[PDB]
Symmetry: C3
Subunit: 271 residues, 3 copies
């Protein structure tokens, strides 16, 4: 399926099954297919599961402009509006934790029943003057430099620390292939703009606007989005939030811990 955003960007999404809806927001630089197992798991147990390809990724159009969190939150708002969702559980992985938080910050939670932040960059990823523990911007600057030389090989090399293959996790070549194949669909410009946006965007104000039940899940072996400065703080700052830490889990834990994730998502929806 598709809808057209305000600026004319056509955004691809899947909408599977029926019941109360769970809307999924993928991480970088993947697309709605990273959720396919969570979606099959939940839609075949009575939920409606929806997942889109963020502008610039997967099967969506690749606009030059709007590759920023306010546009991404507003893209989400249009999707929810288009389908008239109500009592939606918002589920965001990695950079996709930020646009689901920023949807709530910019639009309220009238349509929202719950929030799940998975290995998410919230509340802040890169350094700020009062957040020196964040990741230095120079790290992201180098990533952008390498992306602008060879993004194919950069993503292919990203597989190991993403999935923690360098730390003993076991992930098939098949999954590594599909990861790279999906990433290559994406726009170079969107791929690079998203690094800027997630390096620099401060979601600490969004944390205070979150007034729904919230489950934060993070692997403490996460090489890409460090638990101590993201998920751990997001749980503390969101009033009432629950935290689950998957021990030694990597960033790609929707793959390596798929069953555990599925069950935790089901438990959360049934609380």
């Amino acid at each position: 399926s598709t809808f057209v955003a305000k600026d004319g960007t056509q955004i691809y999404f899947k909408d599977w099954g029926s019941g109360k809806p769970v809307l999924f927001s993928h991480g970088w630089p993947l697309d709605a297919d990273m959720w396919e197992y969570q979606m099959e798991y939940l839609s075949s147990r009575g939920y409606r599961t929806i997942a889109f390809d963020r502008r610039g990724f997967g099967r969506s159009d690749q606009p030059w402009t709007g590759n920023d969190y306010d546009t991404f939150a507003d893209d989400i708002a249009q999707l929810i509006e288009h389908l008239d969702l109500k009592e939606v559980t918002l589920v965001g992985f990695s950079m996709g934790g930020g646009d689901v938080a920023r949807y709530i910050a910019r639009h309220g939670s009238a349509r929202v029943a719950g929030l799940v932040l998975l290995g998410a960059v919230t509340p802040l990823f890169g350094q700020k003057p009062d957040y020196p523990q964040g990741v230095p911007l120079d790290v992201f600057a180098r990533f952008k430099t390498e992306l602008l030389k060879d993004r194919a090989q950069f993503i292919s090399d990203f597989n190991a620390p993403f999935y923690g293959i360098n730390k003993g996790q076991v992930v098939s070549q098949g999954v590594q292939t599909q990861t790279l194949q999906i990433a290559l669909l994406a726009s170079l410009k969107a791929t690079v703009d998203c690094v800027t946006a997630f390096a620099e965007t401060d979601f600490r104000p969004d944390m205070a606007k979150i007034d729904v039940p919230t489950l934060v899940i993070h692997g403490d072996g996460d090489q890409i989005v460090p638990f101590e400065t993201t998920g751990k703080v997001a749980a503390e700052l969101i009033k009432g939030a629950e935290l689950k830490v998957y021990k030694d889990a990597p960033h790609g834990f929707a793959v390596t811990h798929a069953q555990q994730l599925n069950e935790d998502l089901l438990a959360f929806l049934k609380r």
Copy 2:
């Protein structure tokens, strides 16, 4: 090209050349590109070739519901109507043999000039109380369990018996890459439901409804869809059917025996 099925599913197809139409139905888990050489061969020799991506595969939408043979047969009907095709030769590979046969069973053959069943699951694939010689459902249950753990690696390992490479067939890396690339485009859900549909659907009644010239072609080294309980029996159950057995051919014989198959399809069309 696209057409929209009754439930809203957009379905991609290619429509090449001009002349009497030949409409191709692909097997699992592929899409219309598995036919590209037969299409080029026939459309250079004065036939119109049409091939669609089944719903849930390739460039088509991925609906949660309708991944079943009657819906597949009805998709094919809407394609035939959408184009107003007449004297169509229906060609189905593998699971694709069932939906061209179910099309005729549900809609009759008024539009149909002839039927080709290639490495096809007809008349029946899995076991039934009166057909213990079919493949036990257990076997399919395990394929499903594995696909629901890692479909990428499952399809990757599927290349070997599909093509008979595990038994010595020689098939390039490029073929194997393109095979997985196409597979990964499909829906997890459609990919899993098709196994259920092809394991359990009985096309014996459909065989009695086929009243057009029919050529059944099957490799007798087919490790995926065994010759003895499928093509062999389809050729006997269909009044007037002709049988060709490609000696030592694997399941993926549209690749390993492409030239032979092109010539047979051309000779059938010219009879």
Copy 3:
């Protein structure tokens, strides 16, 4: 984005940034993504960049008919008219040099600020009775025969002489993957017809109609499109043309010499 060509073919394109327009025409058997680094480089320095997937390639429709340079040139005119472009700098790579020149030859240069020919097939690639120094038709006849047996493997093997990996150039496995993945998107029919087209189309008359500033760039290690009989001649035949030769560069120099091409394209646009 997409527009619809005269014959109904839908053609995908990207249109990034704003400013004076630069319109890119990819080579064989690639798509608009081959320009993503030039596009990002120029669009973030004040230029509008536009690049399309040729009919039969990438995300565009795969028509059986029209795979010829006059049609390719008219597709480009319809894009230019669709976007109402003025003072456009046309940039063509490899076979893509041919449809931008043919566009000038058929439509005039009223809309055109400039022409850049990169590793281009212009002014003529294959032999003619007055050009035995061209590549013999037999060579393209054999390529076609191989493409019509296994285009997946043929493009895979094409990576090496394309990038000059066999003559010590260094190109990552990620770029070779991406190149193959993009290639597999294309039609078998378009992939083969384009060989016919670039083998046999004479663009010498087009050279005499080019009355805009022109930069010709070629690598003199090009193993695919021989510098001596294409780019070197094109620069001589086009009045006022400037020539740059990238020493030992391969055909795939938009990758191996990306930064240098970027700077040269920027310098040309600022001339």
